[PDB]
Amino acid sequence: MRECISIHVGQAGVQIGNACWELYCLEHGIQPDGQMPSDKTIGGGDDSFNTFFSETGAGKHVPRAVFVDLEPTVIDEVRTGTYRQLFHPEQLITGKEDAANNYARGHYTIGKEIIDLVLDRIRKLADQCTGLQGFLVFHSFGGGTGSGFTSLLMERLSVDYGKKSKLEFSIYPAPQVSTAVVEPYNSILTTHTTLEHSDCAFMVDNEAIYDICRRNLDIERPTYTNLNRLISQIVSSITASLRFDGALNVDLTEFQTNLVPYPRIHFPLATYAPVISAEKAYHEQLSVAEITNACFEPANQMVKCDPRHGKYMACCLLYRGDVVPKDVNAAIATIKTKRSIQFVDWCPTGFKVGINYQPPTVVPGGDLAKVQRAVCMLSNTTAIAEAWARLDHKFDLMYAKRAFVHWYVGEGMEEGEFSEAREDMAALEKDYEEVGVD
């Protein structure tokens, strides 16, 4: 058994982290108390769930989690909430005034003052680890903390834990649930600085989640709560192999090995099905073939884009529930004869498959119905570069006028970083295109 430490940075990172740890506890049968009746090795263990939970002599199961925000109101809700007993004060870290949606302020000004402390509270958890694997880092692209502080943290984690893998769950900005204007700046700034420091990153576009909630949960005006519970489901299906018995994606290194042949192109597309309203009176449960086929509809992707007009480098299918290999392969055969699935020439055309028999757990009173079988597809397709193109175009439009740039310069940054970061992104878009197009 090798341990994983989860780091949640900024508003989006913290609130998604709470939704995830909530769901983890329900999946492993851990109570808000922190007690796990079914763990019969009291006060210890090297079971698979111990990858994410440590144990106290009193039988309390404690997330291997650090929450970090530069203002305190979000983490205070953690300290008062339903899982307040789960965590310990030194895991929750709050500054006093935030980054004001300003990358430079989260990275340079405020970040310099809290980075050393954060790495100390992280060291305290890494010291409880026999075999630390690495880090899962949750954050927004758009916030000044999520963008600016995260890139600083990621740089220093490469210094202090240089052999360790680092995975990101990153919220890509959507105007429909954002009141900010400068998020394209923060997104390109944090991606440039974090790229050589992240082994594998799962982007989630709030636009896609927001639409899924509206179309399939019949929620006319989704909140962050609605979005985060759906995101937590997807995150759980991605991390389930680190927390349960299995032979696929059992350590963080296997994520890069299976999903990322090129280090720079390390942004796998997630697609999830089925999303079913819990208010549906009557619902006909979907088969292995139907949920698998849904993994190739852009309407179910975490990022809207068209994989037909790109090429695959890798594709994993992660099933939870009543699934056996025969039905998966019958579905894949049928799907291949009717969908445009082009792999790059130098990669094998095929799917790695993991099945876990427990069906997805849903939060009681949430919006998602229980289902008998669900799947999350992780495909490294060049089509996700469409999200880079969108965001770089917004960046270009504003930066040609230097709109808002004075806010960043005012906090110690130089215009040169803007153009340096945007050139990296220009190279990235080219990297994707010579991989995916002829």
């Binding site: 309407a299 037909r308 007009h309 570069a385 193109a389």
Partner: protein, 350 residues
């Protein structure tokens, strides 16, 4: 009211569509780079498909199908026909063709057939073309192979060599050659609409199988006849015979109709090509929707068999039909999505 943007300066068709929409009083035009458009009349090259469908609360529509180039570029049309089971290695209505690179190449299979033709004492003239050959340039009709294989390598574009249809149908009076241009509109539901009005693009010169290197005898594009040929305009305006004349002619001269003789298999070919690529380009479940106007070019051999020769992704119209057809695009392609306050199209059902 509805908004739209215009990004192909040089499009006869959507120029007139611009005018039509404004004159309805319910369409406002924006500038090239304003993104809160309902409709994009896009550029031909590197249209930013990735940026469409991400404007909150705007239903967005573009006049091109991403991926439709597989059909509308000569090298890739060859590859699509030979590799798609729907069409297959010996599809009956496309000339035996070969993609050949200068300097997945077929230079050897090209010769295997060419050789068996040599010994067969049967017709073995070929033609070699490119998508970069504008206004009649870059093509070579030759009865001896390596005369065209050297013409291929003397420039850097990828070419196709196809068996030249030696025995074409010839109009009378004139002993003159032609090809048929059909305009096809595919809407956001992927309904396939064939404009009822086609046009024949004629040769003013009589055909002459003897000398291939003389070309306005063999090459029917509107421009080359307009510029290179001495007899340009005798029988019909602009070397453009329309369907009513061509039909009345096929009855008088051949005791048959355009419908039975040619159009049945034109409609078959159009459906075969477009249904084949539908899974790859359909926008039915996508966050933006597409339509596109295509120009299909056909040849008719003397047995009244129809051959497909190219598909044009950005076609122009005949002056006579712009009003009618452009108004048809509005009604079928645009107002279908953005409704306002008989028909000229033949729906090819599938």
């Amino acid at each position: 009211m509805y908004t739209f943007v215009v990004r192909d300066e040089n499009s006869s068709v959507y120029a007139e569509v611009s005018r039509l929409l404004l004159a309805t009083g319910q369409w406002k035009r924006l500038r090239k780079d304003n993104p809160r458009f309902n409709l994009m009349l896009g550029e031909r090259n590197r249209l930013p498909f990735g940026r469409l469908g991400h404007e909150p609360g705007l239903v967005q529509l573009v006049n091109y199908y991403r991926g439709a180039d597989k059909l509308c570029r000569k090298a890739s049309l060859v590859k699509l026909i030979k590799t798609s089971p729907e069409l297959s290695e010996s599809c009956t209505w496309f000339p035996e063709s070969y993609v050949i690179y200068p300097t997945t190449d077929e230079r050897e299979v090209f010769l295997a057939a060419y050789n068996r033709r040599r010994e067969g004492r049967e017709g073995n003239v070929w033609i070699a073309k490119s998508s970069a050959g504008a206004k009649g340039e870059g093509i070579l009709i030759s009865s001896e192979a390596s005369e065209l294989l050297d013409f291929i390598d003397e420039q850097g574009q990828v070419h196709v060599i196809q068996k030249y249809l030696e025995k074409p149908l010839l109009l009378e009076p004139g002993h003159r050659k032609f090809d048929i241009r059909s305009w096809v509109l595919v809407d956001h539901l992927y309904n396939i609409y064939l404009y009822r009005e086609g046009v024949l693009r004629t040769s003013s010169e009589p055909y002459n199988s003897a000398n291939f290197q003389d070309k306005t005898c063999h090459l029917t594009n509107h421009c080359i006849q307009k510029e290179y040929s001495k007899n340009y305009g005798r029988y019909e305006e602009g070397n453009e015979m329309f369907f009513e004349e061509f039909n009345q002619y096929l009855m008088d001269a051949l005791n048959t109709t355009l419908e039975n003789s040619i159009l049945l298999q034109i409609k078959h070919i159009i459906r075969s090509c477009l249904m084949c690529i539908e899974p790859a380009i359909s926008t039915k479940h996508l966050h933006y929707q597409s339509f596109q106007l295509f120009g299909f070019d056909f040849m008719v051999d003397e047995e009244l068999k129809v051959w497909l020769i190219e598909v044009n992704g950005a076609p122009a119209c005949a002056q006579k039909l712009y009003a009618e057809l452009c108004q048809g695009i509005v009604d079928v392609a645009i107002s279908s999505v953005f409704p306002l306050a008989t028909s000229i199209f033949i729906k090819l059902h599938h």
